[PDB]
């Protein structure tokens, strides 16, 4: 009594691994069967998808790949093979798993990457997160982030891609950082990587005292010089250039007999009294000190001040 053949390959009970990089023409396996009748057998494969991907040599059982594979497109196939004798056909299904190779670089997303942060951001603070996927499996899909070149002022966490400030920032030294993030997969035979720019703008904070312009201020004037005559226009600026504050100008000392007047807003230092060169109160001249004070929006004084001391002499 003729008996139908039986397939034997382990992979009918489990899966047949075919790596995605297998070239067209490669023999991916050989079907094996037993039949008790001393009779030739014919091997093949059925189904439109399977017959397009695989060729079976009728006579030997050898299975060949007809078509290129791509795990990231299709990771898996159900495939029915057949073995035939003089009596009929036997069919069994095989789950064919498409094995992964590291053939994709990491991809950044949510670009462009840029942030604005103020110069007083504390060391330790996390200011950005990069995002990247890699569709490969295992270590070939595991991403490590780093800065190339590395930064003295920022770090990025290898696994999480979180950027932190690692040294005190300062608008007065550096207003912009152009950093470069690297994303590398962990596949040790063939690693792959890609790059993204990260733009960090720095923002100004009031942390600089004002400073006097056009120094020095020591001036000689005619002893005859009348009331209203401008000795000098005094000028100071907020060194915080991003959102400067107004300045208030005062005379602190040495203005003997209220001889001079200093306009609070304009800095115009003028003669107010009648000059008398040899009066014993000021025969040596005037050693005047002047203060510029940064003002709050609402015109009340701040603590940011600067003083300069200069001499006014009187001439024949
Ligand atoms: Ca048979
Ligand atoms: Ca692929
Ligand atoms: Ca990869
Ligand atoms: Ca892959
Ligand atoms: Ca600063
Ligand atoms: Ca500042
Ligand atoms: Ca200031």
């Amino acid at each position: 009594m003729n008996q139908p053949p039986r397939f034997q390959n382990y992979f009918f009970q489990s899966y047949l691994l075919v790596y995605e990089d297998t070239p067209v023409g490669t023999s991916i396996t050989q079907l094996q069967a037993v039949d008790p009748d001393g009779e030739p057998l014919i091997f093949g494969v059925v189904g439109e998808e399977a017959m397009r991907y695989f060729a079976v040599q009728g006579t030997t059982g050898v299975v060949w790949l007809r078509q290129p594979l791509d795990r990231e497109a299709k990771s898996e196939m159900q495939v029915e093979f057949t073995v035939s004798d003089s009596q009929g056909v036997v069919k069994d299904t095989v789950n064919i798993q498409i094995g992964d190779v590291n053939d994709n670089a990491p991809s950044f997303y949510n670009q462009p990457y840029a942030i604005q942060i103020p110069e007083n951001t504390p060391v330790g603070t996390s200011v950005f997160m990069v995002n990247a996927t890699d569709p490969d499996q295992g270590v070939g899909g595991s991403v490590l982030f780093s800065f190339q070149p590395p930064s003295q002022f920022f770090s990025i966490d290898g696994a999480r891609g979180i950027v932190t400030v690692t040294r005190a920032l300062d608008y007065e030294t550096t207003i912009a950082y152009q950093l470069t993030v690297n994303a590398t997969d962990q596949d040790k035979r063939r690693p792959l990587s890609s790059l993204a720019n990260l733009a960090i703008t720095i923002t100004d904070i009031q942390d600089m005292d004002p400073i006097f312009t056009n120094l020095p201020y020591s001036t000689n004037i005619m002893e005859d010089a009348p009331p209203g005559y401008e000795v000098r226009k005094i000028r100071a600026i907020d060194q915080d250039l991003g959102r400067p504050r107004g300045i208030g100008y005062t005379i602190i000392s040495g203005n003997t007999n209220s001889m001079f007047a200093l306009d609070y807003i304009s800095g115009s230092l003028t003669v107010s009294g009648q000059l008398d060169r040899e009066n014993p109160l000021y025969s040596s001249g005037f050693i005047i000190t002047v203060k510029a004070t940064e003002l709050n929006d609402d015109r009340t004084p701040s603590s940011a001040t600067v003083t300069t001391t200069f001499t006014i002499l009187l001439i024949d």
Side-chain angles (χ1 to χ4, degrees):
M1 319 196 58
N2 196 295
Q3 297 303 310
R6 311 191 295 290
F7 282 125
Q8 296 179 270
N9 309 78
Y10 69 92
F11 58 68
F12 290 101
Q13 320 307 307
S14 78
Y15 57 93
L16 169 66
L17 188 55
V18 185
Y19 285 93
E20 62 176 319
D21 62 356
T22 298
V24 169
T26 307
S27 42
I28 74 192
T29 195
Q30 187 185 26
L31 300 165
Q32 297 196 42
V34 290
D35 183 278
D37 301 297
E39 172 181 35
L41 296 188
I42 286 126
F43 296 96
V45 56
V46 294
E48 71 102 5
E49 185 179 46
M51 292 170 75
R52 206 197 315 124
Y53 281 95
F54 305 105
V56 174
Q57 180 156 43
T59 265
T60 69
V62 173
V63 185
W64 283 299
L65 178 70
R66 291 182 81 204
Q67 208 93 314
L69 302 167
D70 182 6
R71 200 194 64 76
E72 286 77 51
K74 163 161 35 186
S75 86
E76 199 174 335
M77 294 175 64
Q78 294 290 125
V79 161
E80 277 170 341
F81 295 105
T82 56
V83 57
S84 313
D85 71 353
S86 74
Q87 307 287 295
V89 173
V90 345
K91 185 170 69 210
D92 288 275
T93 310
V94 178
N95 180 235
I96 292 192
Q97 289 281 337
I98 310 307
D100 182 58
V101 316
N102 190 58
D103 61 345
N104 295 261
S107 284
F108 288 99
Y109 60 98
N110 306 322
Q111 292 197 242
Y113 294 155
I115 48 164
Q116 283 228 324
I117 58 183
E119 66 176 314
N120 70 341
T121 296
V123 164
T125 303
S126 71
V127 293
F128 198 69
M129 199 176 65
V130 306
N131 307 125
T133 44
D134 184 314
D136 299 312
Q137 298 308 277
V139 287
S142 201
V143 180
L144 286 189
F145 300 104
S146 71
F147 284 131
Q148 329 254 86
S151 185
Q152 293 268 42
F153 291 90
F154 306 84
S155 292
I156 191 163
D157 193 87
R160 277 136 244 254
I162 285 161
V163 178
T164 55
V165 177
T166 57
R167 263 164 64 186
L169 305 167
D170 181 27
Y171 189 85
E172 279 72 39
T173 302
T174 303
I175 73 194
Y177 296 100
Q178 227 61 17
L179 297 190
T180 301
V181 192
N182 184 298
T184 293
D185 55 46
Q186 298 300 79
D187 191 284
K188 286 166 316 202
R189 207 197 46 81
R190 185 183 143 208
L192 294 174
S193 73
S194 73
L195 300 176
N197 197 252
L198 167 54
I200 306 181
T201 313
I202 309 300
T203 263
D204 194 27
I205 281 285
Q206 289 285 334
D207 69 345
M208 289 281 285
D209 275 344
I211 199 184
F212 283 114
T213 327
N214 325 299
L215 295 172
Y217 289 162
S218 302
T219 311
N220 296 329
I221 67 182
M222 294 303 299
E223 72 184 334
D224 64 24
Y229 173 77
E230 174 158 70
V231 176
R232 179 167 294 270
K233 193 163 290 104
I234 289 192
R235 198 166 151 282
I237 53 168
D238 190 359
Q239 294 184 110
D240 292 295
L241 299 172
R243 206 238 185 193
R245 294 191 295 178
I247 208 86
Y249 302 97
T250 52
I251 289 164
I252 298 180
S253 72
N255 191 21
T256 304
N257 245 287
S258 273
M259 186 53 64
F260 303 96
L262 177 59
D263 183 282
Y264 190 77
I265 315 145
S266 74
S268 181
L269 175 63
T270 61
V271 172
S272 179
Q274 289 184 111
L275 295 161
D276 211 3
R277 197 179 91 256
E278 296 175 49
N279 193 250
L281 276 191
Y282 55 88
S283 68
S284 307
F286 299 82
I287 303 183
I288 310 282
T289 308
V290 151
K291 187 129 89 199
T293 302
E294 279 174 42
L295 304 178
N296 292 296
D297 287 24
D298 81 336
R299 310 287 295 170
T300 67
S302 79
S303 289
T305 60
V306 63
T307 63
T308 192
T309 294
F310 62 96
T311 314
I312 302 156
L313 297 168
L314 269 45
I315 302 181
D316 148 43

